[PDB]
Design an enzyme around this catalytic site. Structure first.
Site, short mmCIF file in Angstrom:
data_model
loop_
_atom_site.label_atom_id
_atom_site.label_comp_id
_atom_site.label_asym_id
_atom_site.label_seq_id
_atom_site.Cartn_x
_atom_site.Cartn_y
_atom_site.Cartn_z
N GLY A 240 4.55 -15.40 23.83
CA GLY A 240 3.46 -14.62 24.39
C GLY A 240 2.86 -15.39 25.53
O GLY A 240 3.24 -16.53 25.80
N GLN B 7 -3.61 -14.91 29.99
CA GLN B 7 -3.71 -14.96 31.44
C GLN B 7 -4.08 -16.38 31.86
O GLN B 7 -4.24 -16.67 33.04
CB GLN B 7 -4.72 -13.94 31.94
CG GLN B 7 -4.54 -12.58 31.29
CD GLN B 7 -5.47 -11.52 31.86
OE1 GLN B 7 -6.23 -10.89 31.12
NE2 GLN B 7 -5.41 -11.33 33.17
N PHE B 8 -4.21 -17.25 30.86
CA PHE B 8 -4.59 -18.64 31.11
C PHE B 8 -3.75 -19.63 30.34
O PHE B 8 -4.00 -20.84 30.38
CB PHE B 8 -6.08 -18.83 30.84
CG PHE B 8 -6.95 -18.25 31.90
CD1 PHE B 8 -6.80 -18.66 33.22
CD2 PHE B 8 -7.88 -17.27 31.60
CE1 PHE B 8 -7.59 -18.12 34.22
CE2 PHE B 8 -8.67 -16.73 32.60
CZ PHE B 8 -8.52 -17.15 33.91
N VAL C 11 2.73 -19.51 25.98
CA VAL C 11 3.17 -20.14 24.74
C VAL C 11 4.68 -19.95 24.50
O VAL C 11 5.21 -18.86 24.68
CB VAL C 11 2.38 -19.61 23.54
CG1 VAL C 11 2.69 -20.41 22.29
CG2 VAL C 11 0.89 -19.64 23.84
N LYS D 118 1.87 -24.66 24.02
CA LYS D 118 0.91 -23.86 24.76
C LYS D 118 0.61 -24.50 26.11
O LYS D 118 -0.23 -25.40 26.20
CB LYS D 118 -0.37 -23.71 23.93
CG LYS D 118 -1.45 -22.84 24.56
CD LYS D 118 -2.67 -22.75 23.65
CE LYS D 118 -3.65 -21.67 24.09
NZ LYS D 118 -4.88 -21.64 23.22
N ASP E 119 -14.05 -15.93 19.62
CA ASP E 119 -13.02 -14.98 20.07
C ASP E 119 -12.30 -14.35 18.90
O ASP E 119 -11.07 -14.20 18.93
CB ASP E 119 -12.01 -15.67 21.00
CG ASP E 119 -11.30 -14.68 21.92
OD1 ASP E 119 -11.84 -13.59 22.15
OD2 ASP E 119 -10.20 -15.00 22.42
N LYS F 5 -10.83 -11.55 16.99
CA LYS F 5 -10.35 -10.22 17.32
C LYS F 5 -8.92 -10.15 16.84
O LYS F 5 -8.25 -11.18 16.76
CB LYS F 5 -10.38 -9.99 18.83
CG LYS F 5 -9.42 -10.89 19.61
CD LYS F 5 -9.49 -10.60 21.10
CE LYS F 5 -8.66 -11.59 21.91
NZ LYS F 5 -8.79 -11.34 23.37
N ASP G 117 -5.98 -19.47 18.71
CA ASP G 117 -6.61 -19.43 20.03
C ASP G 117 -8.07 -19.87 20.10
O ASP G 117 -8.99 -19.04 20.11
CB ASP G 117 -6.46 -18.05 20.68
CG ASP G 117 -6.81 -18.07 22.16
OD1 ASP G 117 -7.26 -19.13 22.64
OD2 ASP G 117 -6.65 -17.04 22.85
#
Ligand SMILES: [Ca+2]
Lengths: 299, 299
Positions: A18, A21-22, A25, A40, A137, A139, A159
């Site tokens: 995956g 945008q920063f 991995v 990563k 974060d 989610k 993450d």
């Protein structure tokens, strides 16, 4: 300090897992041991005004936080390398896909089963909060599984790009996160703490049980307005098989006032997570998740 | 309403001109006329929860706003096509690159010349504010030139992705834009209006004259804090050659109170833009832009 070596001297770099945008991995394997990990790659920000990459101060923060955490429901840091362009974090390989994508394939799911996955998440977050660490974060896509091919999959929170240690009498304010899942104090640019995580847990629970999203509007402008007005409902269209216990759990999380919101310890002790008698356990057993709407909204 | 036809039935599609997160631009030529334009492909968002694409409602808004505006300093819309995935805006071709990039290649540059470019920007914004349109994304990369190869380049404000009509008696709040350039009311999530654009002009002017950025911190968190407390200065390292008229102009734009910030018409009347006597115009002519620090921070 980060190891000033070429990561690929020590690891065979494999297929992509995956790419935010920063970060990007990829699967990898340490040459000396043969053990598998995820690499990563974080692009370092090259100028102050630049909107590309990450400033090394925040990368350092993410690393510093990963190093403090060892828990079955939290991704485990193995090592760190650095070159001119990137910082590369070697992390425990979490290959099982998202929790939500596992559930989307079930043919039946009771609230009892549901709460057992939710408890795994609460265990992870309880651990961080005890250490005064805010994830910031939470989610669905940062809620992953080690192995989706065992009867009851093992959850790993991933993450820590936005994670932050919360210091007493030291104010932290910032704006970030996915609008759908952020607490009102983020939209309102108010003091942030361990409470924001608790808000997110409510929103995730709401979606897991029903397929619907509590605050999501047709545009971001709408989503933010709903969040800050704490505007949501338990539509019978989606919630008619959901227990009162469940809704009470959600209701006590989706609260604006940070000090009235259930803490992580209180969430763990809520009767919907931890029944205190046979009667409650039966009700939960007899309540079913809205798999049909859940599958639909998440495909 | 958008033409439900295949764009390439009517245009020869050429080289990629640029691309953002939510749009890609290719040079094109209308077959029936031979005239060239830019084709802005915007990917339609396919679900409310999705973070990819733009929802049709906001695309409509951008189109609706572009159809209302004809002014020599504003990009001019020509047509709109639509297919299964994309909406295609056929727009005036602005090929001269960014204003900043042209200034950075300059030998010398007085405040008199600088105010000449800033005036062009003010003219475009004035036209917009008269029609109650807020641009909401005033920043260097949205300030382009028609032809960089003529003595005095012609400025064109582009990208109405964030533009919004301001309605009397209708509260508009949202969070958006580039942190470096957003007004305090955006960061604080307060009622938004025409005033935000004026703040942005303040920041852009600050940068153009000095090369430095008024509120730019090491991290977003810091930038947002600086903005909200209106914490900035004129470091003599960079502002030692800058006129008091210029600084007074900036000072009156970088104010927190929306009611006290200069309006567009007040900006246009400011003596640094519109000198009322020979004395002021001399001073302007004798104050030099900091090309050296400007080149460094931007190239
Ligand atoms: Ca606020």
């Amino acid at each position: 300090t980060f190891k000033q070596q070429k990561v690929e001297d020590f690891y065979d770099i494999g297929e992509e897992l995956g790419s935010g945008q920063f970060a990007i991995v990829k699967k990898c394997r340490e040459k000396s041991t043969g053990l598998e990990y995820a690499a990563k790659f974080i692009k370092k920000r090259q100028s102050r005004a630049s909107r590309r990459g990450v400033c090394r101060e925040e990368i350092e923060r993410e690393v510093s936080i990963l190093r403090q955490v060892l828990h079955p429901n939290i991704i485990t840091l193995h090592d760190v390398y650095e070159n001119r362009t990137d910082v590369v974090l070697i992390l425990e390989l979490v290959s099982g896909g998202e929790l939500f994508d596992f559930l989307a394939q079930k043919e039946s799911l009771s609230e009892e089963e549901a709460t057992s996955f939710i408890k795994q998440i609460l265990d992870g977050v309880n651990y961080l909060h005890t250490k005064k660490i805010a994830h910031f974060d939470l989610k669905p896509e940062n809620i992953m599984l080690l192995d989706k091919n065992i009867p009851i999959p093992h959850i790993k929170l991933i993450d820590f790009g936005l994670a932050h240690e919360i210091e007493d009498g030291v104010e932290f304010k910032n704006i970030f996160g996915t609008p759908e899942f952020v607490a009102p104090e983020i939209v309102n640019y108010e003091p942030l703490g361990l409470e924001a995580d608790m808000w997110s847990i409510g929103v995730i629970t709401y979606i897991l049980l029903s397929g619907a999203s509590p605050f999501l509007g047709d545009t971001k402008q709408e989503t933010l307005a709903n969040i800050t007005a704490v505007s949501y409902d338990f539509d019978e269209e989606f919630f008619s098989q959901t227990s009162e216990l469940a809704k009470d759990f959600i209701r006590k999380l989706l609260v604006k006032e940070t000090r009235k919101r259930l803490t992580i310890q209180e969430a763990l002790r809520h009767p919907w997570i931890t029944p205190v008698d046979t009667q409650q356990a039966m009700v939960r057993r007899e309540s079913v998740v809205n798999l049909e709407n859940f599958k639909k909204q998440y495909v």
